Short mmCIF file of C-alpha atoms and ligand atoms in Angstrom, two decimals:
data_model
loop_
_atom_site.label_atom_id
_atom_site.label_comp_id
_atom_site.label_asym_id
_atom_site.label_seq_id
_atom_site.Cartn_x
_atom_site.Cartn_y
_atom_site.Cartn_z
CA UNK A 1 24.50 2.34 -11.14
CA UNK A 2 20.91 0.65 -11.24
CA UNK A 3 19.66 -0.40 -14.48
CA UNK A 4 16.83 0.98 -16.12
CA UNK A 5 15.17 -2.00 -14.97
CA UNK A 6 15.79 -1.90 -11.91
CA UNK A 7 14.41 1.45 -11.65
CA UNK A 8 10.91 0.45 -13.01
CA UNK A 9 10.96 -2.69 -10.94
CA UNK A 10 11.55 -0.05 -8.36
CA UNK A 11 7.58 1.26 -9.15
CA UNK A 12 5.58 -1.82 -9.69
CA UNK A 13 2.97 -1.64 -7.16
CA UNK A 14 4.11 -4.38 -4.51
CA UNK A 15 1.21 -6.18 -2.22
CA UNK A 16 1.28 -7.72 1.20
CA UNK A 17 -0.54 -10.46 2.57
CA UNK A 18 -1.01 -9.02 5.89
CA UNK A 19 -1.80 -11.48 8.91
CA UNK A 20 -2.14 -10.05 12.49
CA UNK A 21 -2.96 -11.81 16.04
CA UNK A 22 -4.41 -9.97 19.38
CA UNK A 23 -2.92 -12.07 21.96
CA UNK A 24 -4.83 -12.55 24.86
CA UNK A 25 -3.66 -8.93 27.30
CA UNK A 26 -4.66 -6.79 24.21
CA UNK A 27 -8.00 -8.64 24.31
CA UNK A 28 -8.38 -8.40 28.05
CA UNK A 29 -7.44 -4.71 27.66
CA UNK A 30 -10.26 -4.11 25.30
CA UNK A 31 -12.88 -5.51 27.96
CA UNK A 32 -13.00 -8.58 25.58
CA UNK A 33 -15.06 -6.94 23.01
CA UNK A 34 -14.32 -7.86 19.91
CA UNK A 35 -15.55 -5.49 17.28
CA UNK A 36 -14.15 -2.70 19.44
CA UNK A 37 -10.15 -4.32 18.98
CA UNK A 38 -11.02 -5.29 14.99
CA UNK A 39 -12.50 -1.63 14.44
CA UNK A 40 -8.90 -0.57 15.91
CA UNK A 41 -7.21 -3.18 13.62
CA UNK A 42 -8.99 -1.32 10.74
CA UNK A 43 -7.45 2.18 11.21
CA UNK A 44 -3.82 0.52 12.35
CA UNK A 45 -3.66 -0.86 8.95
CA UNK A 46 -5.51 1.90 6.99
CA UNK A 47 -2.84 3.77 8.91
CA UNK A 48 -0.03 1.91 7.68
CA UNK A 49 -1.35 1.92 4.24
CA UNK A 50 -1.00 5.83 4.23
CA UNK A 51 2.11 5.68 5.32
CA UNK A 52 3.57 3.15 2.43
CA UNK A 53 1.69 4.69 -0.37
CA UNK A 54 5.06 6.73 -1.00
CA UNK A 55 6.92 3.28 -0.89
CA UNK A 56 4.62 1.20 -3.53
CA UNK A 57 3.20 -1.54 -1.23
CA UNK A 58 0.05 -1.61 0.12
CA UNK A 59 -1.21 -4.11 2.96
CA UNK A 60 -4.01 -5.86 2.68
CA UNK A 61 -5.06 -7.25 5.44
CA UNK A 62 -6.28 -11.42 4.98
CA UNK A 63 -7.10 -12.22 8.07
CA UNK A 64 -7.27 -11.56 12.07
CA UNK A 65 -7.37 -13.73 14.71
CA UNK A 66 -8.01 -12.79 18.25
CA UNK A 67 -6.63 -14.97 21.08
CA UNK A 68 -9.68 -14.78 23.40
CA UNK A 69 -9.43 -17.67 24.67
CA UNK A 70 -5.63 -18.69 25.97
CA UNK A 71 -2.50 -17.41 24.07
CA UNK A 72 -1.06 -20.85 21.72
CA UNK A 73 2.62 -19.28 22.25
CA UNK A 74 4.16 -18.39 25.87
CA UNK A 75 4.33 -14.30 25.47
CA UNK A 76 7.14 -12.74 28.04
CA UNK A 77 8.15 -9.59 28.79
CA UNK A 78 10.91 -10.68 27.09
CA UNK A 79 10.70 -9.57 23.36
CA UNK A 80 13.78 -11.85 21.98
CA UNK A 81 11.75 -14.77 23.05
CA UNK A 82 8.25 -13.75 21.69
CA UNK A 83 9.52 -12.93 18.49
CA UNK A 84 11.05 -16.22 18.34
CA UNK A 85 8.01 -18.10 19.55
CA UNK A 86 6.07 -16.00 17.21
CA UNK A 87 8.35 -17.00 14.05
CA UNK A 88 7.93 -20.80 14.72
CA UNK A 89 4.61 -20.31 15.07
CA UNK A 90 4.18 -18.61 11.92
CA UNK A 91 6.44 -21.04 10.17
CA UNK A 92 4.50 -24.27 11.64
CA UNK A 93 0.81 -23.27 12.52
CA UNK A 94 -0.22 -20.24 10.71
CA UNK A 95 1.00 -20.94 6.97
CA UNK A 96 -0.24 -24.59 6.98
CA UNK A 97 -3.78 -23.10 7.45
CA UNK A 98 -3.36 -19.52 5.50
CA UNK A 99 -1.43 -18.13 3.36
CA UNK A 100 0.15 -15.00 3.70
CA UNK A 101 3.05 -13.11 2.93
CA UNK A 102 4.04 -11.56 6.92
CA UNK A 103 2.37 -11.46 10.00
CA UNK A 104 3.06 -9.32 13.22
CA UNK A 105 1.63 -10.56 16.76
CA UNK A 106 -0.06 -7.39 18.53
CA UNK A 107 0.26 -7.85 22.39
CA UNK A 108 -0.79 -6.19 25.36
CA UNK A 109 2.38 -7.56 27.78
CA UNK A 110 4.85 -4.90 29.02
CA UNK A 111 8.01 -5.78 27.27
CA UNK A 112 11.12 -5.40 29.58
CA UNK A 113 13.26 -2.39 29.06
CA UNK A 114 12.85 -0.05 26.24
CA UNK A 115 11.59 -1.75 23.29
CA UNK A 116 7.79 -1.49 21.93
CA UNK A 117 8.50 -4.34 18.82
CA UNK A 118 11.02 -6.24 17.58
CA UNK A 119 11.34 -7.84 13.59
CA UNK A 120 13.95 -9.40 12.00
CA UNK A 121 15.86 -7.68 8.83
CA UNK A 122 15.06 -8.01 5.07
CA UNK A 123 12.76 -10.95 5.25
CA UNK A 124 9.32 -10.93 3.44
CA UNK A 125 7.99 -13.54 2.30
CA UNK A 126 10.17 -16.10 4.02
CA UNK A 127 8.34 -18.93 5.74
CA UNK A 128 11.01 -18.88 9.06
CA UNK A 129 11.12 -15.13 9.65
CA UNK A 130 8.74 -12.58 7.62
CA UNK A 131 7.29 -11.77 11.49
CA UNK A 132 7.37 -8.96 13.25
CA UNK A 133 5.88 -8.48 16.89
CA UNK A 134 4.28 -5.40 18.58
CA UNK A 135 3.26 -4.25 21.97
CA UNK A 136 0.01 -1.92 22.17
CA UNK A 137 1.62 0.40 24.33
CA UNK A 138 -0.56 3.46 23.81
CA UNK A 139 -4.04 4.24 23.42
CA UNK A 140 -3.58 5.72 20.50
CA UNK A 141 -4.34 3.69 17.21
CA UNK A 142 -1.87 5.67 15.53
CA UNK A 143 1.27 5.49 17.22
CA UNK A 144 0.61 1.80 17.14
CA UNK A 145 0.25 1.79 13.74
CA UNK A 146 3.37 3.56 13.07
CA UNK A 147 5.30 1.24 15.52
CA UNK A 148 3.56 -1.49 13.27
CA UNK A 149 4.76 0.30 9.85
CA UNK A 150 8.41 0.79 11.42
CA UNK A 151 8.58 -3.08 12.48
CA UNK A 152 7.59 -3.86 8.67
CA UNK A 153 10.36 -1.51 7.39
CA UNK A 154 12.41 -3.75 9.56
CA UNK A 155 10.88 -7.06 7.84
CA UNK A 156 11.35 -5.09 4.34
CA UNK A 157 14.98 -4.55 4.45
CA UNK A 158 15.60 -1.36 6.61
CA UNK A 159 18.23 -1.48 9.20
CA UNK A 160 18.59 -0.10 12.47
CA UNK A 161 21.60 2.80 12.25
CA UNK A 162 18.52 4.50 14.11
CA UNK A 163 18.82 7.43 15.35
CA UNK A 164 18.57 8.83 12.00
CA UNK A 165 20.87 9.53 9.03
CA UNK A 166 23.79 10.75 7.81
CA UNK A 167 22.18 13.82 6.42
CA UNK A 168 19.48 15.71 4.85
CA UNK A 169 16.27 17.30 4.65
CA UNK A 170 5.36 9.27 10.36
CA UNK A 171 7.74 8.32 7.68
CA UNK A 172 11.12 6.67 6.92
CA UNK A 173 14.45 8.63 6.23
CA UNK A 174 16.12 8.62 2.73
CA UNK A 175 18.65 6.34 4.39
CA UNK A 176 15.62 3.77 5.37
CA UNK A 177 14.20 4.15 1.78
CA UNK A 178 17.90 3.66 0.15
CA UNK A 179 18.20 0.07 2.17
CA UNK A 180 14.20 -1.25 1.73
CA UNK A 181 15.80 -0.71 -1.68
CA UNK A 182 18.85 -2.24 -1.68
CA UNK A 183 17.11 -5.43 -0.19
CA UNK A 184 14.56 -5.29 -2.76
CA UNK A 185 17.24 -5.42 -5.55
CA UNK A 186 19.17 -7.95 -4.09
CA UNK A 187 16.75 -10.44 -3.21
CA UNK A 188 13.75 -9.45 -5.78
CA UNK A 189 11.24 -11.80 -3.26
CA UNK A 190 8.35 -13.30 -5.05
CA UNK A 191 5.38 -12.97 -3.30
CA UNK A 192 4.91 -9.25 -2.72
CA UNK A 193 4.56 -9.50 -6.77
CA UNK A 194 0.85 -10.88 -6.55
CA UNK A 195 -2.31 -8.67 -6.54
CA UNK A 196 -4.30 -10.10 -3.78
CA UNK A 197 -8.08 -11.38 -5.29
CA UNK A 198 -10.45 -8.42 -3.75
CA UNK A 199 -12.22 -11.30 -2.30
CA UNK A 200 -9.51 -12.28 0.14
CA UNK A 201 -9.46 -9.11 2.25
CA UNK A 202 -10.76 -8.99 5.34
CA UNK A 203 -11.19 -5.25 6.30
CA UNK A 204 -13.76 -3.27 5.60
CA UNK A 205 -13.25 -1.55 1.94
CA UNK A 206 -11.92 1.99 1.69
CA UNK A 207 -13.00 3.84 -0.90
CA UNK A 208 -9.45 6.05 -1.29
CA UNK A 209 -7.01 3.85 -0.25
CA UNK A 210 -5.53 3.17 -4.20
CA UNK A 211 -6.65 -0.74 -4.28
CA UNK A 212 -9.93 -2.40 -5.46
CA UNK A 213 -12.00 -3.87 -2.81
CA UNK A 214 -15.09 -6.17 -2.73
CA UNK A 215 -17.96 -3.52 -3.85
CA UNK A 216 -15.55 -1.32 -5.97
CA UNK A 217 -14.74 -1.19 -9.26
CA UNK A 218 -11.73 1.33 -9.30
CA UNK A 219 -10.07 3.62 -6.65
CA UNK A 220 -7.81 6.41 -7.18
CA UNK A 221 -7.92 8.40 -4.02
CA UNK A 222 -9.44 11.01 -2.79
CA UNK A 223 -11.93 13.00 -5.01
CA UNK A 224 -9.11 15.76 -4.30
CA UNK A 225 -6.07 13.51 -5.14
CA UNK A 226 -8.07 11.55 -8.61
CA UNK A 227 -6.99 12.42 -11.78
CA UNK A 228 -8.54 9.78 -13.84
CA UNK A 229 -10.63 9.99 -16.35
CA UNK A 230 -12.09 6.43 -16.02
CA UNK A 231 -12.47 6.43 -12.23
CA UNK A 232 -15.17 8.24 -10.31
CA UNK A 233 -13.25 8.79 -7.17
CA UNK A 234 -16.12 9.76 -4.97
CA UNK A 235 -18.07 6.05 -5.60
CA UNK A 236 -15.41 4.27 -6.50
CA UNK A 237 -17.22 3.26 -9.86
CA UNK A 238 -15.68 2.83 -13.36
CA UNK A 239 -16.72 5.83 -15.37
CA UNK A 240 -18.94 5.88 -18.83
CA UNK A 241 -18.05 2.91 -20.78
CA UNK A 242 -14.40 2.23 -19.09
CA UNK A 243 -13.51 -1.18 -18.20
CA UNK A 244 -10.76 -0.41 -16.13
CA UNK A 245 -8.57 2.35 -14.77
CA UNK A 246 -5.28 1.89 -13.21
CA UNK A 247 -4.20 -1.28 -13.81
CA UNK A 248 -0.82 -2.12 -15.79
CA UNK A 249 -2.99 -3.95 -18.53
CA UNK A 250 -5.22 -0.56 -18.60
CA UNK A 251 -4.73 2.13 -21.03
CA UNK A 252 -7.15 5.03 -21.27
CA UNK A 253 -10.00 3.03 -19.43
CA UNK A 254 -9.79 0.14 -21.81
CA UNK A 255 -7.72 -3.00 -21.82
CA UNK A 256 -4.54 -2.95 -23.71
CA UNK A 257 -4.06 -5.06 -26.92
CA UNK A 258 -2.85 -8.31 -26.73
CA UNK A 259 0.97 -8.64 -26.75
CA UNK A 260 2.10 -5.23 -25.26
CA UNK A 261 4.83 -6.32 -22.58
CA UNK A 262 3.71 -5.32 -18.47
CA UNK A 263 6.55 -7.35 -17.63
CA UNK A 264 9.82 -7.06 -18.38
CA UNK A 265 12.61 -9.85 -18.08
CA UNK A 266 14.12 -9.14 -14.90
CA UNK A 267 17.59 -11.89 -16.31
CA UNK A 268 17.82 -14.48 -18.63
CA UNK A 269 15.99 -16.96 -17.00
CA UNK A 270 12.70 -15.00 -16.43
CA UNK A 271 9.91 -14.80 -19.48
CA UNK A 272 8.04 -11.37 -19.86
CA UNK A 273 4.83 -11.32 -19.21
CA UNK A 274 2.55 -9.54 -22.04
CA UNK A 275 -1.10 -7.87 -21.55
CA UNK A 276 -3.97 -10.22 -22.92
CA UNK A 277 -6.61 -8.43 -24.71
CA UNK A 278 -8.86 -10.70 -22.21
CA UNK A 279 -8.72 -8.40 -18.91
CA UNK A 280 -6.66 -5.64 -17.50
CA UNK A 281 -4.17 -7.47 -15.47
CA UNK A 282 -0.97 -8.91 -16.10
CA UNK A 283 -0.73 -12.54 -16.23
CA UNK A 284 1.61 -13.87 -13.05
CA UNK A 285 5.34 -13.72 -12.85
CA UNK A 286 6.38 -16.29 -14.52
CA UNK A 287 10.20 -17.86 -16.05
CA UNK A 288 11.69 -19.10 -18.65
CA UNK A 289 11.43 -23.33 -19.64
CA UNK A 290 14.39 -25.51 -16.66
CA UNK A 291 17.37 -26.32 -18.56
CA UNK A 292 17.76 -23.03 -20.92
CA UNK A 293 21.44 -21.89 -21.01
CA UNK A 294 21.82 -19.07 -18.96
CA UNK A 295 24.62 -16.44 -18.03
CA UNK A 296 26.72 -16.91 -20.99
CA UNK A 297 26.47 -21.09 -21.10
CA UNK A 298 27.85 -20.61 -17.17
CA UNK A 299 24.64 -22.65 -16.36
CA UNK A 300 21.26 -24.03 -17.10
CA UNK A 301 17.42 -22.40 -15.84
CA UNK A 302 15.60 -23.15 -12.88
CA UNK A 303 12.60 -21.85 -11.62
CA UNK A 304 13.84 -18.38 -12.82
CA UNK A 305 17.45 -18.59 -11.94
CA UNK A 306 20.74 -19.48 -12.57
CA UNK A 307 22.65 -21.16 -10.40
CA UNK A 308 26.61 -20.87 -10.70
CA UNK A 309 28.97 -21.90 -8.21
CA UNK A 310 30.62 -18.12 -8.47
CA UNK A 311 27.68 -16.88 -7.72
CA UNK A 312 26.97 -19.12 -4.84
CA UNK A 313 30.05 -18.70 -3.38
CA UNK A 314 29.79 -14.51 -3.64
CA UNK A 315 26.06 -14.54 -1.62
CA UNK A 316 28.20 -17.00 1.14
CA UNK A 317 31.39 -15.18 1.12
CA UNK A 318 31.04 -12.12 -0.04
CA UNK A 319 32.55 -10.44 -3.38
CA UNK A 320 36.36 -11.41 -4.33
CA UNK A 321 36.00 -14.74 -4.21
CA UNK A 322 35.28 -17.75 -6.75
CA UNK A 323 34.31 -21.40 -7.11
CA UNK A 324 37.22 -23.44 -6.52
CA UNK A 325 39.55 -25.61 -9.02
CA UNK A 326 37.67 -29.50 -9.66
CA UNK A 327 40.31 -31.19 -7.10
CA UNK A 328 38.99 -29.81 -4.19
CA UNK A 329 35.48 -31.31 -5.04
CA UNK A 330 37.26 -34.83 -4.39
CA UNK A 331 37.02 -34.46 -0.69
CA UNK A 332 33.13 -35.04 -0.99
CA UNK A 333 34.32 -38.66 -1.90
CA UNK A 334 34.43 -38.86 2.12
CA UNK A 335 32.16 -37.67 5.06
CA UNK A 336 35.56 -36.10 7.05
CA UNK A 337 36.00 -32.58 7.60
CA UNK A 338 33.75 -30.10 4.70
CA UNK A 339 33.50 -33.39 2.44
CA UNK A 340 29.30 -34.22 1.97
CA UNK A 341 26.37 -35.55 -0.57
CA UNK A 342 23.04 -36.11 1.39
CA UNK A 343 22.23 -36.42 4.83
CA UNK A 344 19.75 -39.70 5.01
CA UNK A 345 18.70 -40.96 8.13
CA UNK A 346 21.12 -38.67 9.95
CA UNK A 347 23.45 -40.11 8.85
CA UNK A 348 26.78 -38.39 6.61
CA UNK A 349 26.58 -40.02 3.01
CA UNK A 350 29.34 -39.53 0.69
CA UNK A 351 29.53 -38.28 -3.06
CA UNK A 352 29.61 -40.96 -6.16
CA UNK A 353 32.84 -40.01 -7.65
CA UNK A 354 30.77 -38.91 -10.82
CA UNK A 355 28.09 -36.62 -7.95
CA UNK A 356 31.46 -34.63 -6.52
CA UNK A 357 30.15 -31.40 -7.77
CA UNK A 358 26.81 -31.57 -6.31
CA UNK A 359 27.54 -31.99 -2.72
CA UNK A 360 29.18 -29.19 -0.57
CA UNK A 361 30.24 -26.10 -2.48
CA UNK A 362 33.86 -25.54 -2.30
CA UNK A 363 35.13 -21.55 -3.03
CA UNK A 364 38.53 -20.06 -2.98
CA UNK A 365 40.53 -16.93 -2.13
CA UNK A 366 44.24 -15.51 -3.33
CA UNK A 367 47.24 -17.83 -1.92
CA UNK A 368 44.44 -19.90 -0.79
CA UNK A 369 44.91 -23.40 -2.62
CA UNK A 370 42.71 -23.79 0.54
CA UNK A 371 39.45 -25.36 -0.19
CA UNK A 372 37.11 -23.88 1.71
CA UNK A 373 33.59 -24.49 2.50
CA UNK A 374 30.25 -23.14 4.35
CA UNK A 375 29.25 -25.31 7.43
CA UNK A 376 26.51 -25.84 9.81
CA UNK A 377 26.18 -27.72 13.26
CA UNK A 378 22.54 -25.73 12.65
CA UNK A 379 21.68 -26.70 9.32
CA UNK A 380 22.96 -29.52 6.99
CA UNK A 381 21.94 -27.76 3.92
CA UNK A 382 23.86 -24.58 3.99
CA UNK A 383 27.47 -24.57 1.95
CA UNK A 384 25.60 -27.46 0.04
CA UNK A 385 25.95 -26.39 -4.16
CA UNK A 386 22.46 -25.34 -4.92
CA UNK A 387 19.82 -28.04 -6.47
CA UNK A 388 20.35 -27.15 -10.56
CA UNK A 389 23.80 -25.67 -10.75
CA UNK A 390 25.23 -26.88 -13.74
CA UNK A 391 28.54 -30.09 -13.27
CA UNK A 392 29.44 -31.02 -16.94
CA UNK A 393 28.13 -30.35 -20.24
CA UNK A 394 24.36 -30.87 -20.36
CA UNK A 395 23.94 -31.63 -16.63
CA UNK A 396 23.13 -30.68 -13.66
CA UNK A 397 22.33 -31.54 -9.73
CA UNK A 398 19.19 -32.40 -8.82
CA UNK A 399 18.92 -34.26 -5.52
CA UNK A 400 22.59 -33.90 -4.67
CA UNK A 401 23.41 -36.22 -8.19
CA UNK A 402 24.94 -34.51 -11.29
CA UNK A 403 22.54 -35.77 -13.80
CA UNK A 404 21.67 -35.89 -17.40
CA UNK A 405 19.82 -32.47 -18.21
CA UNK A 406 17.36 -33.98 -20.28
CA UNK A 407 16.36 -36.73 -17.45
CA UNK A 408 15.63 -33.72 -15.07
CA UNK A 409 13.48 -31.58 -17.63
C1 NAG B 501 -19.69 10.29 -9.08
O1 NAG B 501 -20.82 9.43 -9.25
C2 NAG B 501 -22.08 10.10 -9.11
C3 NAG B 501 -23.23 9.08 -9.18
O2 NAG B 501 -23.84 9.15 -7.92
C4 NAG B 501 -22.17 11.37 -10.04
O3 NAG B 501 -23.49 11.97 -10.24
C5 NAG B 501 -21.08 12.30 -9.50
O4 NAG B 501 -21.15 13.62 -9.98
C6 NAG B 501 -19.81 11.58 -9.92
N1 NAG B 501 -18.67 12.41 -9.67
C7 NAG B 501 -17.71 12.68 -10.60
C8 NAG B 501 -16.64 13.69 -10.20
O5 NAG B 501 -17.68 12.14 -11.72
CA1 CA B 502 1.85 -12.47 -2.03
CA1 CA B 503 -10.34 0.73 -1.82
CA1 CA B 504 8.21 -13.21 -15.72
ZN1 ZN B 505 12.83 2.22 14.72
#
């Protein structure tokens, strides 16, 4: 069933921007001393590193922030709350500041009941929710650690049906592999794509743990594990003459030619990316030009997808279902019932008769004439037909107006 592609996809090395917190109980726990609780930072994520080798993604930890002084959310023993406090937090005071791809709060308050974390599913790199939260429940560094890991399985993708599989033969059943997959595959997220710069770390380097650090120039692994011939795995220096060792745009410790493909196209809307000559990394993900005709002339590029009102009406509903007939656009002429165009001012604001197909999104099922639509008391924007899909020959929405393809790119 998966593509080729896929597959390979499946074994680019993925990176994450790790961000962690010590709230203020850790902190007091530690007497307040505060190389003691970052030295114990260090081994929780060299400890979680170890554990995800197997997976492809390694952590890099780009920053830690200790709240000696007060905590700036209210943690309580209730762990639904704290995670919630913790994503808005994330969302509206960490990312401003620093970028980063997750973060997990580490906190010394007892949790009620049973719990020792909580995270929500499949959700790296999303601004709301790639957040997990963890209580420091044992002395141990490494249990901790592998609480943290299992949280971050949680934020990549794996559900809880915990308690284990259905059956098989520190780490993560085939089942939890299978859906970290799955999730993967489905929603390809861009950020755990990037290399963080060595410079951005903020752990001391370890020479062994597979990624370059400030004050290395390769690292393979253990002197026991190595089997490089451009790395010297005990120093963590490039061998005789090699420029490079495992990197994609690396081939027998020198830079590949210009041209060769480390890459591929994941659709028709993404451009490969192809080695220079220059250096030994490839160039960022990037996509194809907005506007290209995509998916069979079904639609038009942007930012690296292609946005069809099947499609959009599948991720919503759910496969067997299908955009619906151009009639039931009409009831975006009106504000009554599904019908919308923009929200401005609060207020409900009506389709153009010539807009009707970039408002709300209208799908259908088997009898169902029904026109049916995705709705909100939450959040205006869901149901709404996605910025880009295509509504006539050569155009396409773009701020909730069908518009001339050529005025938008
Ligand atoms: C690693 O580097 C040192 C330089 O101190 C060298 O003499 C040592 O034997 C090297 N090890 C290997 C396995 O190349
Ligand atoms: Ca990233
Ligand atoms: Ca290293
Ligand atoms: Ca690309
Ligand atoms: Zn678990």
């Amino acid at each position: 069933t998966n593509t080729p592609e896929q597959d390979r996809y499946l074994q680019a090395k993925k990176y994450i921007e790790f961000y962690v917190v010590v709230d203020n109980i850790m902190y007091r726990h530690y007497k307040r001393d505060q190389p003691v609780i970052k030295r114990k930072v260090y081994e929780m994520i060299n400890t979680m590193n170890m554990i995800y080798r197997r997976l492809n993604f390694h952590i890099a930890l780009i920053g830690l922030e200790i709240w000696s002084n007060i905590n700036e959310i209210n943690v309580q023993s209730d762990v639904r709350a704290t995670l919630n406090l913790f994503g808005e937090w994330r969302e509206k005071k960490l990312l401003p500041r620093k970028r980063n791809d997750n973060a997990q709060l580490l906190t010394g308050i007892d949790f009620n009941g049973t719990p020792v974390g909580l995270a929500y599913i499949g959700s790296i790199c999303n601004p709301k929710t790639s957040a997990a939260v963890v209580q420091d429940y044992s002395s141990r560094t490494r249990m901790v650690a592998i609480t943290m890991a299992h949280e971050m399985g949680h934020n990549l993708g794996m559900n809880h049906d915990r308690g284990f599989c259905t059956c098989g033969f520190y780490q993560f059943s085939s089942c939890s592999v299978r859906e970290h997959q799955r999730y993967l595959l489905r929603d390809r997220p861009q950020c755990i794509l990037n290399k963080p710069l060595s410079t951005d770390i903020v752990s001391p380097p370890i020479c062994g743990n597979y990624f370059v650090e400030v004050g290395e120039e390769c690292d393979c692994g253990s002197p026991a594990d190595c089997q490089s011939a451009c790395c010297n795995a005990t120093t963590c220096k490039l061998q005789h003459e090699a420029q490079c060792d495992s990197e994609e745009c690396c081939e027998k410790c020198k830079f590949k030619g210009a041209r060769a493909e480390c890459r591929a196209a994941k659709d028709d809307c993404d451009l490969p990316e192809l080695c220079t000559g220059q250096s030994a990394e490839c160039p960022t993900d990037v996509f194809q030009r907005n506007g290209l005709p995509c998916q069979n002339n079904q639609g038009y590029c942007y930012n690296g997808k292609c946005p069809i009102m099947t499609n959009q009406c599948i991720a919503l509903r759910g496969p067997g279902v299908k955009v619906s007939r151009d009639s039931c656009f009409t009831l975006n002429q009106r504000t009554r019932g599904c019908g919308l165009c923009r929200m401005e001012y609060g207020r409900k604001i009506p389709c153009a008769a010539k807009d009707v197909k970039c408002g709300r999104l209208f799908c259908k099922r088997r009898n169902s004439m029904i026109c049916n639509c995705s709705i909100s008391p939450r959040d205006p924007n869901y149901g709404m037909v996605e910025p880009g899909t295509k509504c006539g020959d050569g155009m396409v929405c773009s701020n909730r107006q069908c518009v001339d393809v050529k005025t938008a790119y």
